[PDB]
C-alpha cells in the first residue's frame, strides 16, 4: 500500500550501496547542514536501481509525488534532530 | 632499555614532540643508543649479500626487517626535521634564553646537530638581513632585538595556548584522591578536574609540570 | 633536493650557502637522513610506476630506463627518480 | 615441452635482488593480464615490453641488456635477427616467444636456442613434415647412392618449400589453454574467467571455429561457480548467459541506429541505397514499432517492448532471411551499473585503442600509437568507468564515419572487377587522418569485403586498399581476405606472404617492410603501379 | 619543512600510528626478526590463534599466509545495543574501540572474506552510528567556552580533523577575556 512506496524509497536511499560507497544519503546529509531544504536525484540512476519502481513512476506522476515528499521528510527528520 | 619499550617511547616522544608548541629536552642518552642499534641491524644486509654466493628462499622477514628499518627511520626523520623547524621559528628567543642564567641552558641536555644548524643558520640569516636591509642601518636601528615596542624577537614562549591533552599516569599498584580518579589548577579559576579515560583541552601552561613529569599525554 | 634568475642575487647567495649548509647536516647524519625527502610513510612495499620522459638510464642494478614503460617496483629507487620528475604514476 | 615445469623454472629464475631479469591483438592482452595478475599476487616483478616495430626489437634488445638471465616470432627467427650465437649447456639467457600463428618458423622448434617451445599443448599436430625437414636434413656404386641421396634431399626440400611459405593465421584462442592450465592449478577467478570469455569473443570476426565446441567448456565454468542459488537480492556486488544477437551497439544506442550502422545488415538490406531504406522501415512495420519509439534510448523504452522483443524478432526478421541470429552468448553481471555483452565492451576498448589518445614525424606518430596503448591497459579495469564511457561513445563516431565514406565509395564504383583479384585504391577523400591506423583499414576492408560480396555468387575475391597524405606517398596497402557467410569450409587462410617475399626480393626501391604485420606494407604510388603489375602477373594464386 | 599540517597529524600519519596495533591471526604454516619489538615466536601451528601487530598481518594477508580472525567486539547486535544506548544518552559518547574506523576500512578491504555476511549489514550500521555521533558532537560543541572541553569518547580520526577549529578559536576567547582585565 501507501506506505510501501515510502518504504521503497527509504530502502532506496538507505539501502543502496554501489562499490564501496553509498551516495544519496550523503547527498541529503550534505544538503541539510548547507540549509538546502532540497534534494536532487538522477532518474537514470533510478532506472539503474530497479525496474518495477520506474514503471510505477511512469504510470501516475500526480499520485507518486507525495510519497517522495514523505520519504524526503522522514529521513530529513533524523538529520533534523542531527541538525522546529 | 628494552627495545619494545624503547620503540614505544620512540613513537610516544614523536607524538609528544609534534603536539608540543615549543622545545623539549634533547634525549641524546636514548637517541644515541638507538642510532647505534639501528646501524648495527642495518649492517647486519650481510646475510643477503652472502646469500648470492651459494649459487654455483624465504625473504619475507628480510624485506620486513628492511621495511621496519626505513619505516622507523621515517619516524625519526619527521621527528628531527620537526625539531629543526621549531628551532628556526624560535631561534632568536632561544639564543636570548641561552643568554639568561636561569634555568636550564640550551646546550645539549635541552638541545648537537641542532646547535650547529641553529648558530650557522642564524649566522647566514644575519648576513642576509644585514646585507639587505641594515646598511641603511640607522644608529638606533642597529640592534636586532626587542626595543621595546612592538616588540620583537621575544616571540613566542606562549604556554597559555590551548592544546589537546590526555590524562595518563603511572599507577601506585600518590596524587589520586578519589572518588573516581586524579588529580586536582588555573590562576584565576579553579580545578575542573581530570579522569584517565577522557581528554580535557586546556591551557598548556598548567599541564607543563605534568609533561615534565610525563603525567599527561598529548 | 633531491637527492629563479629574476630573483635578487642576495637570495641566491643565501640560497647556495643554505643548501651547502643543509648538505653539511646531511653529511652529519650518517643516520641516514634523507631528512629533506621521504615525507610520506611507506606501504606496501612494492608500487607500479610509469616513466615520465626518461630514457635513460642504476642504483644497486642498472634497470635500463625506457620511455613510456611502466614497471612494478619497490618504493626505494622510485624515491630517487621521482626527485628528478622522471617517474609519473605512484 | 610441458608448461607446468617450465613455469616452475621461470619461478626459480624470477626472484632476485637486484631484480629480475626477464600491439593489436587483444587475445594476447587477456593472457598477459591474467598471468601478470597471478605473478603480482605472488609479487614477482618483471619487465613489460609494448612491442611495436618488427625490426625495432633488434634496436632495443641488442642495445641495453646486461644482467638479464631469462603474437610475434612465429615467422621471423630472432636468432638471426639478434645474432645469439650460443654461448655456454646451461645458457645464461632465455627469451619467451608467445605466438598463436601457424605454421611455426623452422628455427623455432628445431635449432632450439631461446625456446622453450610454446607449442604445448596446442599444435602436436602432426605436421610430420618438420621431422623430415630436420632429422633427414641433418647432417646431410657410391655415385648412384649419392645421386639418390641428393635427389631425395631436393625432394624433401621441395616438400619443405610448401611449409613456412603460406599465409600465417591464428589457429585457436590462447586464453582457453591458459585458463585450462590455470584451472589445473585450481585457481578460478570470476574476473579472469570473464576476461577469458572477452579474449575469445575478440577474435569472433574470424569465426569460431573450435570455439563452437569450446562453448560448453566455458559453460562448465559458469556451472562450477554459482554466485547465488536464488536471490540474494540484489546483491549490491555481482555473469549470465543471454540470447544475444549480432546487432551492433545494442545497449547504448537506438535499435534504429543499430541496424543503420549494422555491418551484417548492410549488404543484405543494401542500406547505402535507397531501395532497402523502405525495406528497413518495413521491418519495423512488421515489428509494429513507431519511428519515434525507435529513436528513444534503450533505457527508457517500455517493458512490454522489452520482453516482447525476441518474440517479435522471431515473428518478423525471418522474412528477410535473418533466421539464424539469436545466440546464447555470455553477459556479465556487475550489478548496479548494468550488464553488457562481452562483444560490445570489446568494440569499445578497441575503439579506445584507435582514438581517445622526414621519418621522425612518422616514428613520432608510431610513438603516439604506443602511448595510446597504456590508456587501454589502464582501461581494462572495471572500476575506472569514467574513461571507458568516452571510448564507448567515440566508437559510434567511428562507425558513423565508416558507413559514410562507405556510401561515397559505393557511388563511384571504383572497384576493378578483375578475375585474378579485385583491386581498389582510395587516392583522395574527406577525413583521411583516421585512415592512418592500419586497424581502421582492417575493419574498413572487412566492412567492404562483406558488403561487395555477401556472397553473391561466384568466386569471392580479395580486395586491394591504400591511402596516403604526406611523407612522400606512403600508401599503406593491407591485405584483405573474403568472408564466407556460413555456407572454414576449406583451409584457404591467406596467400600474400610468399608474393610479398617475391616482389620484395626484386629491385625494392623505397619499399619499407617496417609494418610488423606482414599483410600491410608502405609503397610509393609511382612504384605501386608496377608492384600491382607484378602482383597481377605472375599471380601466385 | 613539511609545513603540513603542522598542528594536525596527517590521516595517513595516524594510519601509520594505528599500524602498531596487535591482532590475532591463523597462519597457514605448521623467522627471528631482530628489528625492534616482536621478539616472538616459534613457527605457529596452522589455524591457531596468535596475536601479532597489524602491518605484519597485512603483509601475510597480502601473501595469504594467515587467516585473520574477526574482532569479537565487532558484531552487529553489539552495534545495535550501542545505537540503543546512543538514542537514550544525549550527552555520553560511551563506547568506541577508538581505532575502529580505520580498522573497518582495512578489514573490509581484505578480511571481508572471513566475516559472516557483513556486506550491506554492518557497514550501514557503522555509518549510521558514525553520523549520529558526529551530530552529538555538534550538540555538545555549541556549548564550547573556556576552560573546559568535554572530550569523553571518540575515535581519534575525527578528533584529529576537528582539531584546527576548536584549538584555534578557544585561544582567541581566552586572550580577549584575560586580556580585558
UniProtKB/Swiss-Prot annotation, chain B:
GO cellular component, one term: GINS complex
Subunit-level organization: Component of the GINS complex which is a heterotetramer composed of SLD5, PSF1, PSF2 and PSF3. Interacts with PSF2.
Keyword match Nucleus: yes
Coarse class of the protein's main subcellular location: nucleus
GO terms under biological process: DNA-templated DNA replication; double-strand break repair via break-induced replication
Residues of the full protein shown: 54 to 293 of 294
Outcome, altering residue 218 to P: In sld5-13; temperature-sensitive mutant. Defective in DNA replication
Domain of life where this protein originates: Eukaryota
Known function: Required for DNA replication. Functions as part of the GINS complex which plays an essential role in the initiation of DNA replication by binding to DNA replication origins and facilitating the assembly of the DNA replication machinery.
Protein name: DNA replication complex GINS protein SLD5
Species of provenance: Saccharomyces cerevisiae (strain ATCC 204508 / S288c) (Baker's yeast)
Entry annotated with the keyword Nucleus: yes
Keywords, comma-separated and alphabetical: DNA replication, Nucleus
From Swiss-Prot, chain D:
Any Pfam family: CDC45
Domain of life: Eukaryota
Keywords: Cell cycle, DNA replication, Nucleus, Phosphoprotein
Keyword match Transcription: no
Subcellular location as annotated: Nucleus
Cellular component, GO annotation: CMG complex; DNA replication preinitiation complex; nuclear replication fork; nucleus
Record-linked InterPro entries: CDC45
Primary location recorded for the protein, binned into one broad class: nucleus
GO biological process, one term: DNA replication initiation
GO MF annotations, alphabetized: chromatin binding; DNA replication origin binding; single-stranded DNA binding
Binding partners and assembly: Assembles into a complex with MCM5/CDC46. Interacts with MCM10.
Further facts: Present with 1730 molecules/cell in log phase SD medium.
Function: Required for initiation of chromosomal DNA replication. Acts at the origin of replication. Also has a role in minichromosome maintenance.
Protein family (similarity comment): Belongs to the CDC45 family.
Protein name per the record: Cell division control protein 45
Species of origin: Saccharomyces cerevisiae (strain ATCC 204508 / S288c) (Baker's yeast)
Underlying gene: CDC45
Amino acid at each position: 500500500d501507501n506506505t510501501e512506496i515510502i518504504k521503497s524509497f527509504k530502502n532506496f536511499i538507505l539501502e543502496f550501496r554501489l562499490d564501496s560507497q553509498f551516495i544519496y544519503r550523503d547527498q541529503l546529509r550534505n544538503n541539510i547542514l548547507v540549509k538546502n531544504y532540497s534534494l536532487t536525484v538522477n532518474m537514470e540512476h533510478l532506472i539503474g536501481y530497479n525496474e518495477d519502481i520506474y514503471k510505477k513512476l511512469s504510470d501516475e506522476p500526480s499520485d507518486i509525488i507525495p510519497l517522495f515528499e514523505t520519504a524526503i521528510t522522514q529521513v530529513a527528520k533524523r538529520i533534523s534532530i542531527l541538525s522546529n | 632499555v628494552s627495545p619494545q619499550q624503547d620503540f614505544s617511547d620512540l613513537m610516544k616522544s614523536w607524538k609528544n614532540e609534534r603536539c608540543s608548541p615549543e622545545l623539549l629536552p634533547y634525549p641524546h642518552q636514548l637517541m644515541k643508543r638507538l642510532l647505534n642499534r639501528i646501524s648495527m641491524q642495518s649492517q647486519l644486509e650481510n646475510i643477503s649479500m652472502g646469500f648470492l654466493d651459494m649459487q654455483n628462499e624465504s625473504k619475507l622477514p628480510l624485506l620486513c626487517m628492511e621495511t621496519e628499518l626505513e619505516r622507523l627511520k621515517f619516524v625519526i626523520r619527521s621527528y628531527i626535521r620537526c625539531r629543526l623547524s621549531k628551532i628556526d621559528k624560535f631561534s632568536l628567543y632561544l639564543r636570548q634564553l641561552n643568554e639568561d642564567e636561569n634555568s636550564l641552558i640550551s646546550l645539549t641536555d635541552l638541545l648537537k646537530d641542532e646547535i650547529k644548524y641553529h648558530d650557522t643558520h642564524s649566522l647566514i640569516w644575519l648576513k642576509l638581513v644585514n646585507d639587505s636591509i641594515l646598511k641603511y642601518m640607522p644608529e638606533e636601528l642597529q640592534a636586532i632585538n626587542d626595543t621595546e615596542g612592538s616588540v620583537n624577537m621575544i616571540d613566542e614562549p606562549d604556554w597559555n595556548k590551548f592544546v589537546f591533552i590526555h590524562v595518563n599516569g603511572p599507577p601506585d599498584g600518590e596524587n589520586e584522591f578519589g572518588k573516581p580518579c586524579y588529580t586536582v589548577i588555573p590562576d584565576l579559576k579553579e580545578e575542573v578536574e581530570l579522569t584517565i579515560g577522557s581528554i580535557y583541552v586546556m591551557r598548556y601552561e598548567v599541564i607543563r609540570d605534568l609533561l615534565r613529569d610525563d603525567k599527561v599525554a598529548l | 633536493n633531491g637527492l629563479t634568475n629574476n630573483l635578487s642575487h642576495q637570495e641566491q647567495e643565501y640560497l647556495k650557502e643554505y643548501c651547502d649548509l643543509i648538505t653539511d647536516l646531511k653529511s652529519g647524519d650518517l643516520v641516514d637522513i634523507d631528512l629533506s625527502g621521504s615525507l610520506v610513510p611507506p606501504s606496501d612495499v612494492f608500487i607500479d610506476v610509469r616513466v615520465l620522459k626518461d630514457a635513460g638510464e642504476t642504483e644497486y642494478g642498472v634497470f635500463n630506463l625506457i620511455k613510456d614503460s611502466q614497471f612494478f617496483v619497490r618504493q626505494s629507487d622510485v624515491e630517487r627518480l621521482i626527485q628528478q620528475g622522471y617517474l609519473q604514476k605512484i | 615441452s610441458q608448461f607446468s615445469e617450465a613455469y616452475n623454472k621461470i619461478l626459480r629464475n624470477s626472484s632476485s635482488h637486484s631484480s629480475c631479469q626477464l600491439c593489436l591483438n587483444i587475445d594476447a592482452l587477456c593472457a598477459t593480464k591474467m598471468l601478470s595478475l597471478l605473478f603480482k599476487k605472488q609479487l614477482v616483478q618483471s619487465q613489460i615490453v609494448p612491442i611495436f616495430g618488427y625490426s625495432e626489437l633488434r634496436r632495443h634488445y641488442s642495445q641495453l641488456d646486461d644482467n638479464i638471465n631469462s603474437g610475434f616470432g612465429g615467422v621471423i627467427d630472432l636468432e638471426a635477427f639478434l645474432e645469439i650465437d650460443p654461448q655456454e649447456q646451461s645458457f645464461r639467457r632465455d627469451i619467451y616467444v608467445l605466438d598463436a600463428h601457424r605454421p611455426w618458423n623452422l628455427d623455432n622448434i628445431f635449432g632450439s636456442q631461446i625456446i622453450q617451445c610454446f607449442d604445448d599443448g596446442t599444435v602436436d599436430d602432426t605436421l610430420g613434415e618438420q621431422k623430415e625437414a630436420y632429422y633427414k636434413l641433418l647432417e646431410l656404386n657410391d655415385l648412384s647412392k649419392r645421386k639418390q641421396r641428393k635427389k631425395q634431399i631436393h625432394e624433401y626440400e621441395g616438400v619443405l618449400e610448401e611449409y613456412y611459405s603460406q599465409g600465417t593465421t591464428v589457429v585457436n584462442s590462447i586464453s582457453a589453454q591458459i585458463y585450462s592450465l590455470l584451472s589445473a592449478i585450481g585457481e578460478t577467478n570470476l574476473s579472469n574467467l570473464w576476461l577469458n570469455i572477452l579474449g575469445t569473443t575478440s577474435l569472433d570476426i574470424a569465426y569460431a571455429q573450435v570455439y563452437n565446441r569450446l562453448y560448453p567448456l566455458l559453460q562448465d565454468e559458469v556451472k562450477r561457480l554459482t554466485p547465488s542459488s536464488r536471490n540474494s537480492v540484489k546483491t549490491p556486488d555481482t555473469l549470465n548467459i543471454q540470447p544475444d544477437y549480432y546487432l551492433f551497439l545494442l545497449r547504448h544506442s537506438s535499435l534504429y541506429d543499430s541496424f543503420y550502422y549494422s555491418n551484417y545488415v548492410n549488404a543484405k538490406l543494401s542500406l547505402w541505397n535507397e531501395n532497402g531504406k523502405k525495406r528497413l522501415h518495413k521491418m519495423f512495420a512488421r515489428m509494429g514499432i513507431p519511428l519515434s519509439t525507435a529513436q528513444e534510448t534503450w533505457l527508457y523504452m517500455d517493458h512490454s517492448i522489452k520482453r516482447e522483443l525476441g518474440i517479435i524478432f522471431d515473428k518478423n526478421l525471418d522474412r528477410y532471411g535473418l533466421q539464424d541470429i539469436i545466440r546464447d552468448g555470455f553477459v556479465r553481471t556487475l550489478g548496479y551499473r548494468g550488464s553488457i555483452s562481452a562483444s560490445e565492451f570489446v568494440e569499445a576498448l578497441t575503439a579506445l585503442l584507435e582514438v581517445g589518445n622526414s621519418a621522425q614525424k612518422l616514428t613520432n606518430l608510431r610513438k603516439r600509437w604506443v602511448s595510446n596503448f597504456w590508456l587501454s591497459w589502464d582501461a581494462l579495469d572495471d572500476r575506472k568507468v569514467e574513461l571507458l564511457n568516452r571510448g564507448i561513445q567515440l566508437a559510434q563516431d567511428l562507425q558513423r564515419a565508416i558507413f559514410n565514406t562507405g556510401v561515397a565509395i559505393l557511388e563511384k564504383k571504383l572497384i576493378k572487377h578483375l578475375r585474378i583479384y579485385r583491386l581498389c585504391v582510395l587516392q583522395d577523400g574527406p577525413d583521411l587522418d583516421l585512415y592512418r591506423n592500419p586497424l581502421t583499414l582492417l575493419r574498413l576492408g572487412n566492412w567492404l569485403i562483406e558488403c561487395c560480396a555477401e556472397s553473391e555468387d561466384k568466386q569471392l575475391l580479395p580486395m586491394v586498399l591504400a591511402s596516403i597524405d604526406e611523407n612522400t606517398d606512403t600508401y599503406l596497402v593491407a591485405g584483405l581476405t573474403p568472408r564466407y557467410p556460413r555456407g572454414t569450409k576449406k583451409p584457404i587462410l591467406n596467400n600474400f606472404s610468399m608474393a610479398f617475399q617475391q616482389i620484395t626480393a626484386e629491385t625494392d626501391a623505397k619499399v619499407r617492410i617496417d609494418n610488423f604485420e606482414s599483410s600491410i606494407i608502405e609503397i610509393r604510388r609511382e612504384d605501386l603501379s608496377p608492384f600491382l603489375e607484378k602482383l597481377t602477373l605472375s599471380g601466385l594464386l | 619543512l613539511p609545513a603540513h599540517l603542522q598542528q594536525t597529524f596527517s590521516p595517513e600519519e595516524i594510519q601509520f600510528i594505528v599500524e602498531n596495533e596487535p591482532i590475532k591471526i591463523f597462519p597457514r604454516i605448521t623467522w627471528q626478526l631482530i628489528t625492534t619489538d616482536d621478539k616472538a615466536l616459534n613457527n605457529m601451528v596452522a589455524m591457531r590463534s596468535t596475536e601479532v601487530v597489524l602491518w605484519i598481518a597485512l603483509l601475510l594477508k597480502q601473501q595469504s599466509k594467515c587467516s585473520i580472525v574477526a574482532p569479537q567486539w565487532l558484531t552487529t547486535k553489539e552495534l545495535d545495543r550501542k545505537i540503543q544506548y546512543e538514542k537514550t544518552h544525549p550527552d555520553r559518547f560511551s563506547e568506541l574501540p577508538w581505532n575502529w574506523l580505520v580498522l573497518a576500512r582495512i578489514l573490509f578491504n581484505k578480511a571481508k572474506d572471513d566475516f559472516h555476511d557483513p556486506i550491506h549489514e554492518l557497514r550501514g550500521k557503522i555509518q549510521d552510528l558514525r553520523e549520529i555521533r558526529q551530530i552529538k558532537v555538534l550538540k555538545g560543541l555549541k556549548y564550547l567556552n573556556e576552560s573546559h572541553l568535554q572530550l569523553d569518547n571518540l575515535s581519534l580520526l575525527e578528533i584529529n580533523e576537528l582539531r584546527p577549529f576548536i584549538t584555534e578559536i578557544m585561544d582567541k576567547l581566552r586572550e580577549i577575556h584575560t586580556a580585558s582585565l
